[PDB]
Design a protein around this ligand. Structure first.
Ligand SMILES: Nc1ncnc2c1ncn2[C@@H]1O[C@H](COP(=O)(O)OP(=O)(O)OP(=O)(O)O)[C@@H](O)[C@H]1O
Length: 282
């Protein structure tokens, strides 16, 4: 298909260096990752419904004014190609490695980069956001607990199951919070940094697919899991978010299970395996 798509690209946009260009033909969409541009070509006219969803989420996130880059639609959604396509800006930068982020000369700067994005997300107009993004539903964690029990419990030791029931229950115990923007995979590989005059700057965030109106604690949990307690303590102290710790820990207690349940439900053996490692024996 992909030498069709390429002519379509050269047809729609003459100048587009396709040597060096990466390619992900995952489940629903083919993505051409070019120099300064990304092209998403859905497979099936069903999956093409996602293109205006992605425009709507990126436009809503852009309007919050986070102070960091988010992918920009460079084109309207087009009915060209097999089922349509969307061109987005490519964001430049590299994920921050744990070791790169905790050195004593950078940790305050790194904390403040996370804090200023988290602060702007917590201060978003959620009335505007609730019209476009998904919203945290009070039933989410009961839901997740059901699927963990259905799918992973039979694979666990009895001690595994008892640990998981406690972690699931701490999540189900949390009351319902929907007061800001939540990215939902913060401190992943989709958070991009650059050296700006020899110090880290958080320049871009890609992958707004899981974004919603939700709990500010959920993104803080992910920063902690990725970068360790020293860094998340600094971000929390800057945010004045000391009251969130029990919520933060409840999110974090569900991350190994989230891994495992998505490994199964999607079909990655290494994920499914590695989640469960603490819910079995050597
Ligand atoms: N506008 C962009 N700027 C920078 N990198 C981008 C951009 N769009 C896509 N990418 C990169 O190319 C990849 C294309 O895959 P896609 O966006 O479908 O994500 P995925 O990794 O499959 O999904 P997920 O991380 O949500 O499970 C992304 O993972 C990201 O690294």
């Amino acid at each position: 298909t992909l030498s069709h798509l390429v002519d379509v690209v050269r047809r729609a946009h003459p100048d587009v260096d396709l040597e060096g260009a990466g390619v992900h033909s995952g489940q629903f969409h083919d993505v051409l990752i070019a120099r300064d541009r990304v092209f998403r070509f859905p497979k099936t006219a069903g999956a093409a419904a996602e293109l205006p969803g992605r425009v709507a989420v990126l436009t809503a996130v852009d309007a919050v004014e986070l102070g960091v880059g988010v992918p920009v639609p460079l084109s309207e959604v087009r009915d060209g190609g097999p089922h349509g396509f969307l061109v987005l800006s490519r964001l430049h930068g590299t994920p921050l490695e744990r070791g790169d982020a905790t050195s004593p000369e950078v940790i305050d700067v790194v904390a403040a980069e996370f804090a200023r994005v988290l602060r702007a997300m917590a201060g978003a107009d959620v009335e505007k956001l609730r019209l476009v993004l998904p919203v945290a539903d009070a039933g989410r964690w009961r839901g997740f607990a059901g699927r963990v029990r259905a799918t992973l419990f039979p694979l666990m030791s009895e001690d595994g199951r008892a640990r998981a029931e406690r972690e699931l229950a701490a999540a189900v115990a949390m009351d319902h919070v929907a007061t800001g923007l939540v990215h939902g995979d913060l401190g992943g590989e989709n958070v991009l940094w650059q050296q700006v005059e020899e110090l880290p700057r958080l320049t871009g965030i890609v992958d707004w697919d899981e974004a919603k109106v939700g709990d500010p604690a959920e993104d803080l949990a992910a920063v902690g899991a990725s970068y360790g307690p020293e860094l998340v303590e600094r971000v929390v102290a800057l945010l004045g978010a000391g009251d969130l710790w029990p919520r933060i820990r409840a999110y974090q207690g569900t991350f190994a299970l989230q891994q495992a349940l998505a490994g199964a439900e999607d079909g990655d053996d290494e994920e499914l395996e590695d989640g469960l490692t603490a819910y079995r024996k050597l």
